[PDB]
Design a protein around this ligand. Sequence first.
Ligand code: ZN
Ligand code: ZN
Ligand code: ZN
Lengths: 318, 318
Amino acid sequence: MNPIAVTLLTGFLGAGKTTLLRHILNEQHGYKIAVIANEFGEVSVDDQLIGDRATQIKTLTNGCIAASRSNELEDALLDLLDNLDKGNIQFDRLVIECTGMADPGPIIQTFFSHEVLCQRYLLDGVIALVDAVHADEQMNQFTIAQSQVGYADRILLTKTDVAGEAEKLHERLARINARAPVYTVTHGDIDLGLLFNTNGFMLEENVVSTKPRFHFIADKQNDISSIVVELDYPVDISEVSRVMENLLLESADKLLRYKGMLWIDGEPNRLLFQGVQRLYSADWDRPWGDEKPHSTMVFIGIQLPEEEIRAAFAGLRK
Amino acid sequence: MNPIAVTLLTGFLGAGKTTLLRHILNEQHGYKIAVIANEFGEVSVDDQLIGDRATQIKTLTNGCIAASRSNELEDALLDLLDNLDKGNIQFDRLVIECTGMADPGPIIQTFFSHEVLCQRYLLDGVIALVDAVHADEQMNQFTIAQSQVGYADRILLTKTDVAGEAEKLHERLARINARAPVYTVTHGDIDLGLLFNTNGFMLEENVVSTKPRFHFIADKQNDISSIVVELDYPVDISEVSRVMENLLLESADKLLRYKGMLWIDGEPNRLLFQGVQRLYSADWDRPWGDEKPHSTMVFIGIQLPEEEIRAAFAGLRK
Ligand SMILES: [Zn+2]
Ligand SMILES: [Zn+2]
Ligand SMILES: [Zn+2]
């Protein structure tokens, strides 16, 4: 068995998504993709079936699959599995549209809700589409516009050609999400392949992509931000375990995503961790070797108590 | 078998919730309540067990139960049932904390996710705690503050003694949520009884509590609002079914809650419906009798296309 790679496509509504979704559903791009979305529009349908849980599953002419969703995403996920195993449909990538006002959080959690889903589906990454022209206005008005960026493993920034100076926006995206690289497509369309193989849900040693700079006045502009913590000292495995558990429990409803690499006292291998809201996990990785040991952590969330968080880790110092 | 009454406690953080949560877990109030929350604080624990799904379940001195939760709410819900049926714990009410930045949406959906949950648990209502002093600022800054109010079946407005004439606030809450009655909590503690027995998730014929008035300028202050639709004409059951389905599909990520009573052409009984986001249901109810037939519907959501919605129902006119 090979796990189905799941991509979440998020961002505020725009014509850019439509062009991308149209390409997936219509062209002969060679990908075997199942798409879950609210509306599909004018698409060439080969066949159509209804799952045991009432999921409307259409097989398209290009070989891809278009599946509707109800309020329970589990039902679509399970109906897709049933019909895959029955040989009714064939796919190895799942793309879920969660644009507009959708919160990527509950969608991610669905994939960890049941053992069958944990085994048969494997989250690839969260892709955030960002319109350079309207992003600032959208993020100022709606918290969720920032949250979608905060959940992202990869940010696709479009329309910078017409928006003008993109850097002010580039800096804001980095303050919100210090994890995710920002891809700025100036000429041409978004390549479909840029949605895939982000490795966003694997343990990483390089948890920060855009190293934070010093801009105190503008750093407190967003409600969702990244806290980057760097330690040049090792910590006790029992102690840091307590700190994390207290931290995560304290800001449970505030935390979107968080990842880290830890220098553990007396241990020659890196300790990596990652989490989404309440769900977190950790494991050992590459040995330090000749590389200088250190800890790097990034916490992305809303109204996080940065002061307390930094103090908590500071107290781990002997 | 008799379903456990479930109360969702939401609203922005404060000492009011804290006192309320402290009161539930500590005082001898005569209620048999299980509480799911992130933090419980210092509470006198009688006994403690770990569920099969790793849920930490504590029995308190006042007879109440304190249960922890992970990222998967189902785990706690199922573990509570297991230990209830085994005779390890006893309760007939469940209170779930979803205050702060928490979204009541995914929590509500959990209770419809599986048959066992649908049969053993019965969602009674969503209670929104509102701080009269800080509510305006919070709702201006955070969409989720408005959303929590929009999901409510009952609104508890506290601290009006120090806020003063919170009449302006009354109107704003009513604009956001035309469904939910507002109770002004007098100086001091929120009484436990105010959380219970709303019957918020049953089909209702009296869907609107605060019948909307004309405040054209103020009606544009909020991102979440209620659309109240009144029809003095019967509609075709197939046609209004089409209108609703298109409406729901168009604003799927925007709709928080909606309820209605419908006058159906040729049918002597009221048709009642209710929904939360994508999940909706309808059934026939009390005959019209000598009472004048009419339709009343309320739609609560963010950036709803009121114009299109009203046009859609207008088009159902013969
Ligand atoms: Zn489930
Ligand atoms: Zn009033
Ligand atoms: Zn008084």
